[PDB]
Structure 1
Amino acid sequence: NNYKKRLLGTAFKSSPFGGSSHAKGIVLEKLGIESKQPNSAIRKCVRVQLIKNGKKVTAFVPNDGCLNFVDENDEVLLAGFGRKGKAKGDIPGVRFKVVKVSGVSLLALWKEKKEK
């Protein structure tokens, strides 16, 4: 007998933690990032504090016309786009990624749906 080895490890304790299908949290600032090499654009993202851990994270309002939220107050749900321990990403260091809110998002919808 013998021998245990490396790779994926037990110890955890990250930043959304709940491996959450999101993370509710209020919309601290509206920081439209800026594209990485090769591609190039003003990558409209959003910074917010996670009600849960309070911990602050910033992620792409990724939609296509929807800094509709952009409510410094209002509270999205964020939620990572599995890279996993990485970002996509034309979009430079953004970890998780915008979700739904003010709690309720297509993200565009009720009534109609607009687009994006």
Structure 2
Amino acid sequence: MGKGKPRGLNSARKLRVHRRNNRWAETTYKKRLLGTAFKSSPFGGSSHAKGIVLEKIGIESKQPNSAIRKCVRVQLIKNGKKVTAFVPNDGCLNFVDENDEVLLAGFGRKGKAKGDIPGVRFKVVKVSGVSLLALWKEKKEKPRS
């Protein structure tokens, strides 16, 4: 068996073409090419996005572990799209409140779900210009209302 690919000394262009063709099966590559992040993906293919807290929503978790996961329905400012952001640590949701500006981040999985929280893709990071972790700690205090 010569094994598929042409092993000729002048078979280079063909090989290149083949490689290119193959490239469209690789998912990451495809994404990079087509601008799926730029055309979809609530964020603009960005790390973060500021968004308005439309409402506090407890979401029921996937399976095995059973609980309500204190998420927030956020409306992204730049695009106008509506997403659901999980809110970390104990309480935290109280701190976040309602109708606040909220700086979101990706959850970890380059999109996709994060473990058990179904239909949820984002960590709330900052609420109206602080930081959720900090608030939880009480190392830093909130700037009043």
Cα gap change, 1:34/1:5 in structure 2, threshold over 3 Å: closer, same or farther?
closer
Which of 1 and 2 has greater Rg? Answer: 2
Cα gap change, 1:97/1:10 in structure 2, threshold over 3 Å: closer, same or farther?
closer
- For 1:113 and 1:58, locate their aligned partners in 2 and report how far apart those are by CA, in whole Å: 27
Cα gap change, 1:115/1:45 in structure 2, threshold over 3 Å: closer, same or farther?
farther
RMSD of aligned Cα (Å):
4.8
Q: Which runs of 4+ in 1 moved over 4 A?
A: 1-12
1:15 to 27, 31, 41: 41
Q: TM-score, normalised by structure 2?
A: 0.63
Superposed displacement of residue 7, structure 1: 10
Question: What is the identity percentage for the equivalent residue pairs of Structure 1 and Structure 2?
Answer: 97
Superposed displacement of residue 110, structure 1: 9.7
Cα gap change, 1:104/1:77 in structure 2, threshold over 3 Å: closer, same or farther?
same
The CA deviation string for residues 43-70 of structure 1, in whole angstroms up to 9 with x for no partner, is: 1110011111111111101223211334
SS at match of 1:68: helix
Superposed displacement of residue 97, structure 1: 2.1
Moved more, 51-60 or 7-16: 7-16
SS at match of 1:30: strand
More helix by share: 2
Is the CA contact 2:87–2:124 (under 8 Å) kept in the aligned structure 1?
yes
- For 2:97 and 2:28, locate their aligned partners in 1 and report how far apart those are by CA, in whole Å: 57
- For 1:52 and 1:73, locate their aligned partners in 2 and report how far apart those are by CA, in whole Å: 16
Cα gap change, 1:4/1:96 in structure 2, threshold over 3 Å: closer, same or farther?
closer
1:59 aligns with 2:85: yes
Structure with the bigger RCO (C-alpha within 8 Å, sep 6+) is: 1
Is the CA contact 2:47–2:105 (under 8 Å) kept in the aligned structure 1?
yes
SS at match of 1:15: coil
Long gaps (5+) in structure 1 = none
Is the CA contact 1:16–1:23 (under 8 Å) kept in the aligned structure 2?
no
Q: TM-score, normalised by structure 1?
A: 0.76
Superposed displacement of residue 14, structure 1: 1.7
